[PDB]
Each structure stands twice: as C-alpha cells, then as structure tokens.
Amino acid sequence: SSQAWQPGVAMPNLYKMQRMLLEKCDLQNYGDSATLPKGIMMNVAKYTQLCQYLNTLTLAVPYNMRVIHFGAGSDKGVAPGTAVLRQWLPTGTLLVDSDLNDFVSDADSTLIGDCATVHTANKWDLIISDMYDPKTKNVTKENDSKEGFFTYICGFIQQKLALGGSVAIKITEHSWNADLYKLMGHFAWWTAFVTNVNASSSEAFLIGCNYLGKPREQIDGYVMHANYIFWRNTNPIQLSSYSLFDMSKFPLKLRGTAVMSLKEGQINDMILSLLSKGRLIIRENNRVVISSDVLVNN
Amino acid sequence: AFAVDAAKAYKDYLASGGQPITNCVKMLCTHTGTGQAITVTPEANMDQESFGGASCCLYCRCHIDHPNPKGFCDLKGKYVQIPTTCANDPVGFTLKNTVCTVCGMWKGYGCSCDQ
Numbered sequence: 001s002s003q004a005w006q007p008g009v010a011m012p013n014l015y016k017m018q019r020m021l022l023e024k025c026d027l028q029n030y031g032d033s034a035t036l037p038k039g040i041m042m043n044v045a046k047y048t049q050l051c052q053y054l055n056t057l058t059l060a061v062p063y064n065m066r067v068i069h070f071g072a073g074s075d076k077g078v079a080p081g082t083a084v085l086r087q088w089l090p091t092g093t094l095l096v097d098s099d100l101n102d103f104v105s106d107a108d109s110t111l112i113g114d115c116a117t118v119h120t121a122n123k124w125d126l127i128i129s130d131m132y133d134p135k136t137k138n139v140t141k142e143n144d145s146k147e148g149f150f151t152y153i154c155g156f157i158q159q160k161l162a163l164g165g166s167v168a169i170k171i172t173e174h175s176w177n178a179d180l181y182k183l184m185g186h187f188a189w190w191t192a193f194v195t196n197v198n199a200s201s202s203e204a205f206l207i208g209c210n211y212l213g214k215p216r217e218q219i220d221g222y223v224m225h226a227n228y229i230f231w232r233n234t235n236p237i238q239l240s241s242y243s244l245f246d247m248s249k250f251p252l253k254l255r256g257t258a259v260m261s262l263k264e265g266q267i268n269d270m271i272l273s274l275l276s277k278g279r280l281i282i283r284e285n286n287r288v289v290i291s292s293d294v295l296v297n298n
Numbered sequence: 299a300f301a302v303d304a305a306k307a308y309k310d311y312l313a314s315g316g317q318p319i320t321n322c323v324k325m326l327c328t329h330t331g332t333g334q335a336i337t338v339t340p341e342a343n344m345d346q347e348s349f350g351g352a353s354c355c356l357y358c359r360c361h362i363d364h365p366n367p368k369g370f371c372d373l374k375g376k377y378v379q380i381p382t383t384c385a386n387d388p389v390g391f392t393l394k395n396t397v398c399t400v401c402g403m404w405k406g407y408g409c410s411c412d413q
C-alpha cells in the first residue's frame with residue numbers, strides 16, 4: 001500500500017468486470033480509526049480526500065460553475081463538507097446545499113427539507129451527495145436495492161445534470177441503489193472511491209465522470225454492487241490521514257471549460273468526444289433559480 | 299426599544315466560566331497564508347487556524363438576526379483566521395476583536411499599522 005499516501009483507493013477496473021454474488025461486507029480493518037490531525041473533524045478530512053481524488057479526474061470546470069450538495073447538514077448543525085467544497089471550488093463558483101434538518105452553511109444558498117422537495121430551474125456541473133439513512137444498516141434482513149432519496153438522485157441526474165458534468169454520490173454496503181449504478185454507465189468513466197481516512201467503513205463515493213446523457217455501457221446495478229462488496233471484502237485498505245498534510249495543490253484548477261447550448265440533434269460523436277475528455281459542458285447559462293416545495297396542512 | 303443582546307450574553311456566559319461554542323469547522327490548509335482575518339479561502343499562517351466562517355458566527359450559530367439593518371453576515375461563505383492560542387473559542391474571538399480596515403489583519407493579532 002503505496003496507497004497510504006493517496007487520498008484514497010478507487011475500485012480497480014478488473015473488479016468492475018466480474019459477476020459476483022452479493023455477500024455480507026466484512027472489513028478486516030473494521031473498528032480501526034485513522035488518527036486525524038489535531039482538531040480536524042472526520043467529515044472535513046473525508047471531503048478533503050474526496051476533493052483531492054476528484055482533482056485527478058477530467059472534471060469540467062467552467063466559469064460560473066454550478067455545484068449542488070445534498071445531505072450537507074450535520075447533527076452539529078453546521079456543514080463541514082460544504083466548507084471543504086467552497087475551499088476547493090474556484091472563487092465565484094455558485095454552491096447550493098440542502099439537508100432534511102436545519103443547519104448553518106457557507107453555501108451561497110441553502111434549502112431545508114426532504115431532497116424530494118428540491119427543484120431547480122437550471123442544470124448543474126457537479127452534484128455531491130452525502131445523504132444516508134442509518135436505518136438501512138440492518139444486518140438481519142436481505143440487502144436489496146434501496147429507494148428513498150436514491151430515486152430522487154437518479155431522476156435529478158437525468159433531468160438536471162449538464163452534459164459533461166460529474167457526480168459523487170455516497171453509498172455503503174446497505175445504502176445503495178441498482179439504478180444509480182446503471183446510471184454510472186451514462187458517463188464517460190465511473191468508479192467507487194473509498195477515502196483513506198474512512199477506509200474502515202463500507203462507505204464509498206460513486207463517481208460518474210463527464211455525463212453523456214445516454215448509456216455508454218450497460219451496467220447491472222445488482223451485479224455491480226456485489227462486485228463492489230467483493231472488492232472491499234478482499235482488499236483491506238490501510239487507514240491513512242497522510243494526504244491531509246499536503247494541501248499545496250488542493251484547489252480545483254479553473255479550466256474555463258466551454259459551455260454551449262445544444263439541442264439533442266446536435267450531440268454528434270465529436271461533441272460526445274469533447275464531453276468525454278472534460279472539455280465541454282452543455283447547458284443554458286441563465287440565472288440559477290432554486291426552490292423547496294412546502295406542504296401546507298394543519 | 300427591546301432587543302436581545304446575544305453578544306453581551308455570550309461574553310457574560312464566558313466570563314462566568316461557561317464552555318465556548320463548539321463544532322466550529324476547522325479547515326485543512328498549508329498554514330503559509332497571508333494571515334488576514336477574513337478571506338475568501340483559508341489563509342492561516344503558522345500562528346493561526348482557518349475556520350469555515352458561518353460556523354464561527356454567533357448569530358448564524360444561535361439562529362438570531364444579525365445586528366445591522368441589512369441583517370448581513372460578513373463571516374458566512376468566507377474563512378476566518380483565528381490565532382492558534384485562541385482557537386478553543388472562535389466565536390468569542392470574532393465577537394471580541396476587530397479587523398484593521400487598511401491591512402485586513404486582526405487588530406492586536408497581526409496588524410502592524412501603528413508602530
């Protein structure tokens with residue numbers, strides 16, 4: 001594990017190609033803990049390593065980039081992950097976050113409520129989700145694909161992610177969705193990324209890199225989650241905070257990626273190739289407008 | 299004429315020996331920054347910690363109005379640099395101190411405009 005100086009470990013391609021049956025996740029390093037730098041919260045460390053890994057991918061980074069962050073609240077009432085995203089993203093990036101429960105945030109705008117109540121007029125260049133329901137961690141019943149906020153996320157990606165855009169969606173052994181894995185085949189590339197600080201957990205971020213709006217690959221999400229658990233079960237990851245101590249190249253490079261409005265008929269193979277290399281975003285460039293539905297009763 | 303004075307209440311709470319507001323969001327950074335007080339990205343120097351601004355704002359954290367006509371917050375969406383010796387109480391520090399308007403450092407914690 002020269003992996004210990006990386007921000008984390010991405011699922012190796014050969015594991016994605018297997019056809020494993022789903023098993024219980026049993027991590028060798030379960031219960032071990034990384035020693036975090038003095039006074040640093042796990043969620044700051046975790047998001048820092050996620051962003052350090054995203055720095056290695058062909059993310060589209062336009063001017064006036066638009067980023068939305070679901071599950072951004074904490075039981076502490078603050079938003080550590082949003083604070084890391086704002087540190088990472090270029091100055092002037094529009095950052096919106098959201099959570100079921102009230103919290104105080106550094107985002108440009110914050111919506112409180114179930115994510116299913118959230119609607120946006122505009123499309124987005126990057127979607128981050130840390131949403132998680134601890135009730136899913138029920139080891140005594142079958143581990144089937146989960147709906148809930150995953151259904152919202154799948155629709156939100158398909159309806160409101162700009163072509164060329166990217167996502168990072170938190171999953172665990174029990175918090176996962178087959179359609180979301182299938183949607184990973186609608187990006188130019190995808191992986192499941194495990195942070196080195198939280199490697200003792202079955203958590204991963206499902207990352208779709210450069211959205212193409214159509215299936216590039218057909219993925220069976222039940223098989224792929226089994227493949228993910230098999231990888232985790234057979235590849236212990238050494239807990240590590242090493243990458244947190246070198247922040248000199250942390251900020252996301254502002255690439256000024258071109259943004260174009262194009263109708264479905266003009267997305268040819270040459271456009272698809274630019275999208276696939278992180279060189280193009282396809283969306284409108286009007287105002288960012290968001291809202292949360294409020295149910296009225298007595 | 300009645301207005302709640304949360305700043306006074308927190309100062310008096312601190313003086314009476316109350317434990318400072320916790321869970322201010324401390325950032326990872328190089329600690330080779332400009333050391334200015336309130337910045338668009340973490341700028342802690344060797345003697346400072348950088349925090350997410352909203353989490354260090356008394357009014358943000360207590361869910362109360364900000365004390366100005368506009369109700370505007372000059373910490374939220376920014377990063378605040380706190381001297382490491384004061385980082386046990388970032389909210390108290392920001393409440394009790396002032397930013398030099400010419401150099402941007404904390405008066406008495408980096409501002410050298412008067413020597």
Ligand SMILES: Nc1ncnc2c1ncn2[C@@H]1O[C@H](CSCc2cccc(C(=O)O)c2)[C@@H](O)[C@H]1O
Binds near residue numbers: 072075099101134149
């Ligand atoms: N449908 C939704 N709509 C909007 N928001 C949602 C939705 N579902 C979840 N969330 C939000 O995501 C975050 C999930 S963490 C929960 C957790 C579990 C175990 C340990 C910890 C810990 O850190 O100690 C935290 C919370 O803030 C939660 O409110």
Ligand SMILES: [Zn+2]
Binds near residue numbers: 352355356364373374
């Ligand atoms: Zn405030």
Ligand SMILES: [Zn+2]
Binds near residue numbers: 398403409410
């Ligand atoms: Zn000065």
